[PDB]
Amino acid sequence: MKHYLICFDVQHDKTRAKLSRLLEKYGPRVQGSVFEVSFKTPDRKRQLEYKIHQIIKQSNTEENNIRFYNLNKDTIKHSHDINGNPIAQLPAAIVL
Amino acid sequence: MKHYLICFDVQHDKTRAKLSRLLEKYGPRVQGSVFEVSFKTPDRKRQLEYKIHQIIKQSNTEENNIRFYNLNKDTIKHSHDINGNPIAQLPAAIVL
Amino acid sequence: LVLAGDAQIITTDNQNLIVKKDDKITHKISLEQLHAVTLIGLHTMTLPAKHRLLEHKIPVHIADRTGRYLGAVTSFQPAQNNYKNWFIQLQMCDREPFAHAIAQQIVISRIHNQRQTLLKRKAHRKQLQQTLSNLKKLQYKVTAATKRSSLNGLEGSATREYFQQFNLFLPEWAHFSKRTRRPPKDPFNVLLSLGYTILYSHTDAILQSAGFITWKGIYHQQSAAHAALASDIMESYRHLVERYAIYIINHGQIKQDDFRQEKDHLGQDTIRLSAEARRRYVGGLINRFQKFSKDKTLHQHLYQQAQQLKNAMHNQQSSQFQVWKELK
Amino acid sequence: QGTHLVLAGDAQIITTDNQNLIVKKDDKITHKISLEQLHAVTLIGLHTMTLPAKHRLLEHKIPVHIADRTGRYLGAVTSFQPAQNNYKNWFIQLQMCDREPFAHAIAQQIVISRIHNQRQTLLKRKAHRKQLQQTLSNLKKLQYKVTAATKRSSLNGLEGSATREYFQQFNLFLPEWAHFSKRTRRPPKDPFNVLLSLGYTILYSHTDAILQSAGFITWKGIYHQQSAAHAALASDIMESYRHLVERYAIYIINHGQIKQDDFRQEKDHLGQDTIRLSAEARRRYVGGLINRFQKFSKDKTLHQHLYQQAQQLKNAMHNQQSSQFQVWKELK
Amino acid sequence: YEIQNAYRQGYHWVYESDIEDFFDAVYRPQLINRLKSLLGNDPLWEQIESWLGQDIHIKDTIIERTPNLGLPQGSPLSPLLANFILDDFDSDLETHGFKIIRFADDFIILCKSQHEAQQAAHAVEQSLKEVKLSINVEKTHIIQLNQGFRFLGYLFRTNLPPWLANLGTKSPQPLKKSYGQIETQGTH
């Protein structure tokens, strides 16, 4: 159980289009090129990175401009927006 | 002291330029449009936030996709890119 | 995730779980963050969603609008195919001295908690003296019980003399004399039988995440549709549902205008809650679970107790596991 | 007990009338079983289940065993009482799958049944009997030796010799283009091995699911090696029933439902040369084979029969007697 | 200087150097052609092929190999003839971001990232598991393996080149001098 933040700037729009469409499912598109991803077991991280390698081989550009950050339980607590709104807060029990 | 990374997405062609010209002083332009900054007292964070707000008023479209994601010590410890290179790391004693 | 609402329809993405009510999307939770799911009411689940939740070993528990428990969708393959901990548990649970010691602990905890909850109503102390003394006498015999077969009878008598005293606190429209379990047929009993399933689902999901197999129990040998081990551990923690119900009824949050009465499937007088009262009750219960004793929510106390029980069973010592035993 | 209803067809729809369970296929009622004579349900694939049916089953303590399209066993919608059977017989199986008199009695019976059935398969041709008298006498001679062999390797050798002597003769049956000579290769180069491979995989998967549903641990085997990458008990019990695939394959090739057109020559991503079966032909063959599984007997279908066999083996382990478990032998 | 120049190129990870990993990728007709060019036309070369392309017998199972590919491990000619034609892999190491630096009858392996190695290893492991399953179920008797001979005991007790798997079975190592992680008050 680990939270991650996924960010990139790949030069060609069509090459990074497949990056974006791959990464829609794993986490919400919180901003223009930033994703909030939740993982349970590192093997899913390994396979996601394997596919990212696949598309960057497809691009034939060797883009290392993909960056993953961690988001701990208290790192979330001091995280916010400019207007003070808390961000990246995951619910404990949804009573739908 | 607190370590933040600032990620912004604004479409006004001149307002984006002015935020780019502002945030390069406090921290390195690590990504295309993602910066890393560090503060020691929160009033210094507030001063930067007010400068950002002053700049984004000239947009006249009210953009608000500017996020301050915190970074801890262990969070930095677990962070990496695809290659495995540790990222957002800081030195303890530079022996220049 | 909980679905105590009205007529939701769970479907899947192969990556996400989508909850649509009348073709309106209500949630799109990722499968990497989901822990369990409870279905109280008439909620649907498409079969490929069942395939995905059975692959990821995510429990789902089912119930009906009355609140009585029905069953669960669980898998019998272990975590990483390691049958070690399951075999250890199935060996240890039928050993007689070990299981007897833990069942004695659980019964003594339950009777102490019941005595304590009957002890914090000051204004009725004169009415509640003798009963308390009798509970003490029952506790005075639980230490002297030498066979596991006597614990069921002693706990049954204790629960009877405890539940007979709620007629003094409750209003006249909610009086009752017997805990009617399978068809709840009283205004007050629906509250208890709807809180117990939330409590059971929490402890069951925690236990199954620990590494246990919840179906086999220590103190509850013969059960009716409840997993025996989860319904065994939650014995000490089931005054949080018999105090919240009194608080809700007395302080005017839920009144007799909410209950709906029908005849079901052959004709039986069944009392239930409308959807909005069910949502309010379940939300309040989960909120009171979160505000456990400070620095620890109830989930983070049940995982601690599960680890302590596992260490008691692996080292073959019955003294490591310590029942909760709410403060003197 | 009662009927243990198994749905392994293609997209049935289950509904309840509040006192019966009704399974319809294209709005034609295929099953209608009272809830007092129902004991379990097994769903292999995708079968829509109306919500009142699920609630009525859960209220009556009738487990619903859910399995994948291929045949992998996932779990079951249960409660306490139907789920006590999934773990109340784990320890005794691990005890009684290692005790050598019991295990060797059962492993003698299984091989006896296999050789008997593969004699019966050749007996039913009745058109090339004169060429097969020698082969049938040889198979009888090999079968009579299984009654005495007191080790596992002897059983393995006898069964291997019997299987070779059984497959050496199929060139009389198949047409000219389908004649195969050499033993089976992991990448196939002839059609008949492809057909047999599909059949064996389907039968193994379904046997595995039906064994797991009865409450067994399928990696602890009595006659095969306890190992990963396969289930020992499923590949163990499925030996008696292997003749169905072979008879069906001979039938399909002879009666012309599959011709030389349907096989496709290609090279895989690994680059190794393969010949495979086209998608339409594969779907047709799988449907026909499941139909033959459903036409097993007037009373029972094959899945209910395997459930009854698993219950018999469970009783045999429970009472320690090694001959209460009588194996299927295709007695006429 | 060559190591630091390669670090400047981007090759930040190194591997332990063993010629064994390159036994499963050798294409024999190129080797025979090179020898035929150096030593001249000779009747020995045919014999050499007959020593290198044989089939293994294990428990009445014939494990073959893909025609015109590979050198058998555990033979005396193989270590000599493997590094004789090692340079021909350079292009196939260039496309996948690998470099070899030679010195003192030895070499060293340099790579940008470690994802293709792990994918090749995971593909090989899955293939071996399916081969063992089809041993025990469908009673196969002639098995043709392209890769994975090092784990040939396992059976009994897109395409990536076969040396990638053998590299992926290993764990690599990396190659104003800062001196640790920043403290509560700052850096000194």
Author numbering:
A (entry chain A), B (entry chain B): 1 to 96
C (entry chain C): 654 to 981
D (entry chain F): 650 to 981
E (entry chain E): 436 to 592, 617 to 634, 641 to 653
Report text from the authors:
In some CRISPR systems, a reverse transcriptase (RT) fusion to the Cas1 integrase and Cas6 maturase creates a single protein that enables concerted sequence integration and crRNA production. In this work, we determine the 3.7 Å resolution structure of a naturally occurring Thiomicrospira Cas6-RT-Cas1—Cas2 complex using single particle cryo-electron microscopy (cryo-EM) and investigate its activities in vitro to elucidate how RT activity might coordinate with the CRISPR integrase and with the Cas6 maturation nuclease in the context of a Cas6-RT-Cas1 fusion protein. As observed for previous CRISPR integrase structures, the Cas6-RT-Cas1—Cas2 complex is heterohexameric, consisting of a central Cas2 dimer and two distal Cas6-RT-Cas1 dimers. In this study, we identify a type III Thiomicrospira Cas6-RT-Cas1—Cas2 complex containing three active sites for CRISPR spacer integration, reverse transcription, and RNA processing, and we observe all three activities in our reconstituted system.
